[PDB]
């Protein structure tokens, strides 16, 4: 507010100017983007699903530069497609960054295919079987240990996401339409299905294995 | 039971690089005041209404404190209560007029005040010390108190304070239980007519319209 600190008063805050230029995490940003840049208007043709976004995202949202939008609507072997005879949307702007937002792709994927995730199971005696029918999920965490009833999660997330298990019962697949929901569900599952670093009996998200450890 | 309460910052972004790092509300998102979906009729607020009376000499001022600041409102109220706005003001006596406040629940507070504010109540020779009550409790139990205390602490510290205080009326709700006093909020009225049409309708060929409808069908 209106009070000088001792560091900034006496010392003058000289610490900030006492750092070394070595042992850095990342290299310095190259100062190449100097005066002499020429901007151009880029345009991209997106599927007709983005129409669900509406005007509240393309016009109401404030931005540094204008963000136009148009909808080319057309009345309705080998899939021989061309640039004519089909509907689409034109999105044009001067900033390429605005033409790469994840929301635009989500608007299409959510209403077309959705999202999915997978969990891998490992360990001796670790099996994920099925009850008579859905929704009733039970997972056995080793030999001699009682199974885990996972019906709560499925009831919570009913109609938003679904869980599938292979014949073997070593893979837990999750399929949904909601990114957030899917992720939440996956992480919820993994929270109680997490594997032990020593015995290595549990579950793990793909492309993120756990490192083994040994006692000294 | 065994952990700290869930604050308002738990349900939103944190921006240390700004004045308002996180928004604070008296209640959760899922707990905010709301209106019943079936409106039996629409209502409109009159902002403020005033009643004079020459015979009895008691004047009334009904205000609508909907989306207003507590401090400002309190400040304004103080003036009226004191009666300083009149020419014939006597500090010895209470020259003010009765004030009615509604929609107290709808008040606002800037900054991190909803989650970092408390109220102390003194105790005569108590070892525990003064009783401390959080503002969320007061909002939950009796919203009117929020304004009441601000006004009270604003009023001069004299023997007249109680008197001035008594004349103050604050309600959480829209309407008031009073009999002989107009309402700030009244049923809506029909909009006024316009002497001009801002549209230019031009129909197309019926044959082409029918052909297009058949094609679309």
């Amino acid at each position: 507010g209106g009070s000088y600190g001792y560091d900034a008063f006496f010392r003058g805050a000289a610490e900030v100017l006492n750092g070394s230029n070595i042992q850095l995490p990342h290299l310095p940003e190259n100062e190449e983007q100097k005066e002499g840049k020429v901007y151009q208007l880029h345009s991209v043709r997106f599927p007709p699903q983005v129409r669900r976004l509406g005007a509240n995202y393309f016009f109401r949202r404030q931005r540094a530069v204008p963000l136009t939008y148009y909808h080319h609507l057309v009345e309705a072997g080998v899939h021989a497609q061309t640039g004519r005879g089909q509907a689409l949307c034109f999105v044009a702007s001067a900033n390429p960054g605005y033409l790469q937002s994840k929301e635009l792709e989500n608007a299409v994927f959510e209403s077309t295919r959705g999202f999915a995730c997978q969990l891998i199971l490992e360990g001796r005696g670790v099996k994920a079987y099925f009850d008579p029918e859905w929704p009733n999920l039970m997972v056995r965490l080793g030999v001699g240990v009682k199974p885990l009833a996972l019906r709560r999660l499925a009831e919570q997330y009913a109609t938003r996401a679904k869980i599938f298990v292979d014949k073997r019962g070593l893979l837990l697949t999750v399929h949904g339409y909601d990114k957030c929901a899917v992720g939440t569900l996956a992480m919820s599952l993994f929270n109680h299905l997490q594997a032990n670093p020593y015995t290595m009996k549990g579950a793990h998200v793909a492309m993120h294995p756990i490192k083994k450890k040994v006692t000294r | 039971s065994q952990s700290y309460p869930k604050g308002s910052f738990h349900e939103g972004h944190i921006n240390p690089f700004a004045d308002v790092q996180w928004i604070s509300r008296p209640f959760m998102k899922r707990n905010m005041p709301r209106d019943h979906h079936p409106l039996a009729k629409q209502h409109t607020s009159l902002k403020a209404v005033t009643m004079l009376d020459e015979e009895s000499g008691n004047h009334w001022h009904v205000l609508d404190g909907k989306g207003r600041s507590v401090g400002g409102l309190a400040a304004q109220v103080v003036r009226l209560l004191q009666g300083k706005h009149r020419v014939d003001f006597t500090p010895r006596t209470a020259a003010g007029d009765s004030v009615i406040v509604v929609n107290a629940i709808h008040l606002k507070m800037a900054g991190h005040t909803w989650d970092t504010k408390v109220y102390k109540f003194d105790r005569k020779t108590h070892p525990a010390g003064p009783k401390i009550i959080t503002a969320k409790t007061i909002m939950a139990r009796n919203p009117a108190m929020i304004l009441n205390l601000a006004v009270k602490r604003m009023l001069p510290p004299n023997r007249l304070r109680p008197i001035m205080y008594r004349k103050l009326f604050v309600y959480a709700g829209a309407l008031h239980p009073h009999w002989q006093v107009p309402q700030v909020i009244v049923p809506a009225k029909t909009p006024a007519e316009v002497s001009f049409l801002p549209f230019s309708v031009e129909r197309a060929d019926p044959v082409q319209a029918a052909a297009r409808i058949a094609a679309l069908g």
């Binding site: 209106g2 009070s3 000088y4 600190g5 001792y6 008063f9 995490p25 990342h26 | 700290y4 910052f9 738990h10 944190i14 240390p16 790092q21 996180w22």
Partner: protein
């Protein structure tokens, strides 16, 4: 690993904020859990100097009242020593 400051020690560290009792910054590392840092034990703050006192703190501070009695005194200005004054 509570620390009084934060630094980027890994190749993929990210400065995040944790929803603890209070808003607290921190550093999370994926390749090494030991590098997880949480700034929650800082040094006590000092009492700052008001701004309005700045004018009378820095720079050459001249005396408030000047000295003139030593350079003002004279015999002619005193009735006890005036008669002794001689201009011839």
């Amino acid at each position: 690993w509570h620390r009084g400051t934060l630094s980027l020690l890994c190749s993929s560290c990210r400065y995040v904020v944790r929803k603890w009792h209070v808003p607290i910054l921190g550093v999370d590392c994926n390749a090494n859990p030991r590098h997880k840092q949480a700034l929650s034990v800082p040094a006590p703050r000092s009492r700052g100097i008001p701004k309005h006192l700045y004018p009378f703190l820095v720079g050459k501070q001249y005396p408030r009242h000047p000295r003139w009695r030593q350079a003002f005194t004279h015999r002619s200005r005193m009735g006890k020593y005036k008669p002794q004054v001689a201009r011839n």
